[PDB]
Design a protein around this ligand. Structure first.
Ligand SMILES: *[C]C1(*)(*)(*)=C(*)(*)(*)(C(*)(*)C2(*)(*)(*)=N(*)(*)C(*)(*)(*)(=O*)C(*)(*)(*)([C])C2(*)(*)(*)[C@@](*)(*)=C(*)*)N(*)(*)C(*)(*)(*)(C(*)(*)C2(*)(*)(*)=C(*)(*)(*)(C(*)(*)C(*)(*)C(*)(*)(*)(O*)=O*)C(*)(*)(*)([C]*)=C(*)(*)(*)(C(*)(*)C3(*)(*)(*)=N(*)(*)C(*)(*)(*)(=O*)C(*)(*)(*)(C(*)(*)=[C]*)=C3(*)(*)(*)[C]*)N2(*)*)=C1(*)(*)(*)C(*)(*)C(*)(*)C(*)(*)(*)(O*)=O*
Ligand SMILES: [Cl-]
Ligand SMILES: [Cl-]
Length: 301
């Protein structure tokens, strides 16, 4: 198709995911899958997925999520551990409910317990006793690097006009240093900063990925695009991916620092090969970011 009609987006309405997980959307009157990422049946080792009742999916997903489905104030979002498919694989399933559109379950392959409590006790002490923002942010990048193994870790700070600053940095020997560089606010646009106040960790596994569309794209329950604000698998803005490609970065982890309800900064990690961190380690990063934000609050008071 050509002609005139043929031929800086609402990032939370991406309609697609990154390929290192599967996404199911479930209607809760009948507990059937009403949307799924196009890769779901392959990824989960299932013959079919769309339209299938959870009870009929090979494995124990339904039994595992049942205890968390009734309304509760201390409930979702919540992660469960289950087995799915034939051949059966273990998964971690992250569940949340968008405002409308049903119940979202995002599934990643499970791995072993991560045993970082002995690293964490002293990390927490270093955080709670940091005497300045300089000290705190320097310790932050070191701690994150140790925990996560990324080739570069930065604290990226926002000012009141939204401009960005690389306030702290560590990196593997021999790499480029971005320490102290400034960037325009347009590089992390307002709608993205607002999203990051609600969705506190983002992982981009491979910047060169091909997005995996939701099928159907539009929610059967709303007739609108699915609100993917809370989706950890959400596909990321092409404009941002191009930015990272032009720097040669292959993978990223970002963790929000939220102070007084505002996005104060990000812990931003780069890797020069594809990289994924699983749910348990993401949870630790989030706990660390809350501890750091508490200390920023005190230091700024
Ligand atoms: C839509 C969107 C953009 C847009 C965008 N970036 C640009 O460079 C231009 C001016 C414009 C359009 C192309 N940027 C971002 C996100 C973004 C983040 C947050 C990433 C994350 O994983 O949470 C960050 C940290 C940056 C900028 C940088 N990252 C770096 O490491 C460095 C420098 C060392 C910079 C400057 N941009 C989005 C939203 C992406 C999404 O879908 O969540
Ligand atoms: Cl529903
Ligand atoms: Cl079951």
């Amino acid at each position: 198709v050509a002609g005139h009609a043929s031929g800086c987006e609402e990032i939370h309405l991406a309609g697609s995911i990154q390929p290192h997980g599967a996404l199911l959307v479930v209607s809760e009157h009948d507990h059937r899958v009403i949307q799924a990422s196009a890769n779901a049946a392959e990824f989960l080792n299932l013959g079919s997925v769309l339209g299938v009742p959870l009870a009929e999916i090979d494995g124990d997903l339904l039994i595992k999520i049942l205890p968390h489905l009734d309304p509760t104030a201390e409930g979702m979002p919540v992660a469960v551990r289950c087995r799915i498919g034939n051949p059966s694989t273990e998964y971690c399933g992250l569940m949340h409910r968008p405002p409308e559109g049903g119940l979202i379950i995002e599934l990643e392959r499970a791995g072993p317990s991560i045993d970082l409590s002995g690293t964490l006790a002293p990390a927490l002490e270093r955080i709670r006793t940091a005497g300045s923002l300089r000290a705190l942010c320097d310790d932050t990048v070191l701690l994150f690097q140790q925990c996560t193994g990324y080739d570069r870790v930065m604290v990226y700070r926002f000012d009141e006009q939204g401009h960005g600053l690389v306030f702290s940095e560590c990196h593997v020997p021999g790499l480029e240093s971005y320490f102290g560089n400034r960037y325009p606010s347009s590089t992390v646009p307002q709608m993205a900063r607002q999203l990051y106040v609600r969705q506190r960790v983002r992982v981009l596994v491979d910047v060169t990925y091909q997005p995996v569309p939701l099928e159907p794209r539009l929610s059967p329950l709303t007739g609108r695009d699915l609100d993917m604000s809370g989706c950890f698998l959400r596909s990321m803005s092409p404009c941002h991916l191009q930015f990272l490609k032009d720097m040669g970065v292959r993978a990223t982890l970002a963790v929000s620092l939220v102070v007084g309800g505002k996005l104060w900064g990000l812990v931003v990690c780069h890797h020069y090969l594809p990289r994924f961190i699983r749910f348990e380690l993401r949870a630790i990063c989030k706990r660390l970011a809350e501890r750091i934000a508490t200390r920023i609050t005190a230091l700024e008071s």
